[PDB]
Symmetry: D3
Subunit: 157 residues, 6 copies
């Protein structure tokens, strides 16, 4: 079985983001086409091991910002697939940027929306950058070796 | 004396977006290094003239969405400079994507934040994609012929 | 008032190619948004002046081929706009490649089809690379300062 | 043994194209450096499973065209190697475009020409985009783990 | 009549660098196809005005280095043409990098070698990145509106 | 254990370059995250098997130069990781270019400096293109499956 690596594109700044984050991670553990061990998870790759939520002194540190921004870009570019955990009511400017960068690096761009939200309107530009969008409950079985383009079954705004 | 064109990256949903929109447009009218006539303004480039406010059925039409998404991308890629009107309290996933695309297309990426908001925290990836971020009040006089790299004087989360 | 440069993507082998070539060139002479003097016209940029019709031995010379191929690429990349004179009954693998390169270099990609042929089926990938496809008769007046995305009004196989 | 995936660049619109198509597919089955199971074959990845030759109603459907064009681009970008089954007397504008896109995505670009045709002149731009070109009868043994640049043993036009 | 901007890729450490620097600058002043005012000259764009000769402590500051590196990249990407003042006996790893970046950004890449040095061996990769290499004495009159591909008349190691 | 391939970026034109070359190669033999067999080593991939140091007749051969330049680019683009064996006192314009090309191809860019030299100032642009820089003695154990961004522990100039 060939396995692909991913970049774990996900916000961690609301309750629904954190729920979706936890679910997507569990799905990837169970997906046999994914090497999660060798995938890039931003939250474990922040500069110096520090997160600005737990250490607000780094809010103005430009070294921390430079290194953590660069590590994320590096995580996208050196992994096979771009994953975006996407909350339609709570869309993330950071993830938006990362989607655009992933496009520029020739990565498959897959959005995953919580089942409770799948079908709701999403930003036109998210719709467009995406190669495909699926429900959280499809993530454990998604075949990352044969990724295809498909349209969201949903509206844009 | 030489003038550059821009893509007008700006939301139009909320009150603060519309205020900033109006201000940024006024600033560009007054900036002698900008050819606004030949710049790309999304709101004046709605596909086939269809107005989605008066016909929201087109938000489920894949052709409408494809052409609108493509027009935006096209507007970024065929103009000199990427302008992002950025509201820190109302950060936009669509703008985020556009910023990343502009980076990939080799464009100068300039964010403009309302003076009332300049200093407030912005997403790390917005900070990083940007080549520079300035206050609305500096847009009138920004020299687009000699665009330089600088850091936001502000917080980043 | 501002003028853009183009790469003149057009075959010169067949009768229909040469007719379309002559027409497109005439249209560009008359278009006020085009600087034709500073555009790249392959046929006037033959390497070292060597004329391959009168010296076909150079078709086996790797240096001749390297420089000619590179000049074409260079002409696309250093000009504003990619123009493809496209004959639906005589589709050209070389033009196809040039279109893809122009896409990769962030250029507006405009196809022009003779009015007698506009509507006839074109290759799916030609349809897709293109930002727009127009009739020869619209080239005279095309505004290259405000190039927009649109779909071919025609069939695609 | 490491294996690479490919995009199966090949026309299917003439008798010689179909012959070459069949031969190249058989060669890939036998090549131990290729994972054919996880490779992208356009003809099995058309939108909705439908081919326009067998269902000409889709000749004007822009949804079908959008999705099938996008899936092909996605197939090139997410696979390791670009393969072009190339008939020198019957060159394909679609494949031409795909070669250019593959170049932009940093893929090895390999042309395969039927033995009966190998040596015949090929389009200059095909010659140039290519990293290498081989005979159909070399395809079963080509080592895709160690792909190198070489010149066609043949003319251009 | 139309003028193009450049990035002034040139070292300033050695005597030969400084001689060539002075000469190339003089040539560009006299070239009517160049807008030197709006070109990017590193030495006039030192970050925050800090002069590293008088304050070498900033060579250990990561913020200084980040901004300076980014300014250079920005200067290449937002100008029309990449100019590399190249000394064959004193080849520069930094210039090498800048050349590669300019290639990636779709810029014409022109090397200029002092006439006393034109013909001397240059690195294979310098030879290859370049679209053209000329003598200092030809810079005054180089037509930057019609930049063409050609080979160095000289040795390459 | 997943393995990655590399491009062996290294000069071979001084005694210290050759020492570092030999050491880096030995380190890669011992690194279990590297497939060295399928990696690209320039010195074994020169056109026709010939090196210009041992056959100076090829110093003016443009065919040799074209093919060997193109093979190196191909070696960077088809391998997972860009390695630069870097001597701070003896920096290489060729490697500089290759670093820039590797950046454009989305590759992890890793510099390796002899332990005797690690800490010495390096060119600003080398510092910036790099994703990370390590000592020769770290190379045998570097985990290429989880490559991260880090700052050089050293100065620039
Ligand atoms: O806004 C946070 C984003 O930065 C990057 C992370 O994946 C996350 O998606
Ligand atoms: O013209 C048909 C082409 O579209 C794409 C397929 O590979 C094929 O090469
Ligand atoms: O200057 C020599 C360089 O060309 C390329 C090789 O890796 C080497 O790094
Ligand atoms: N604090 C952060 C914001 C966005 N992305 C990150 O990786 N970290
Ligand atoms: N009908 C088609 C033409 C070209 N390419 C395809 O994948 N399909
Ligand atoms: N002679 C050479 C110089 C640079 N790079 C190479 O691969 N070969």
């Amino acid at each position: 079985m060939p396995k692909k690596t991913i970049y774990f594109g996900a916000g961690w700044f609301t309750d629904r983001q954190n729920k979706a984050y936890k679910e997507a991670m569990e799905a990837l553990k169970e997906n046999p086409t994914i090497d999660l061990e060798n995938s890039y998870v931003p939250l474990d790759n922040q500069y110096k091991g520090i997160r600005v939520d737990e250490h607000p002194e780094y809010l103005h540190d430009k070294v921390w910002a430079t290194a953590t921004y660069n590590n994320d870009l590096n995580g996208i570019k050196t992994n096979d697939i771009m994953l975006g955990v996407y909350i339609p009511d709570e869309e993330d400017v950071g993830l938006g940027m990362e989607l655009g960068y992933a496009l520029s690096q020739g990565k498959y761009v897959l959005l995953v929306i919580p089942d409770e939200d799948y079908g709701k309107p999403i930003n036109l530009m998210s719709w467009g950058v995406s190669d495909n969008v699926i429900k959280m409950s499809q993530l454990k079985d998604f075949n990352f070796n044969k990724p295809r383009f498909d349209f969201y079954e949903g509206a844009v705004y």
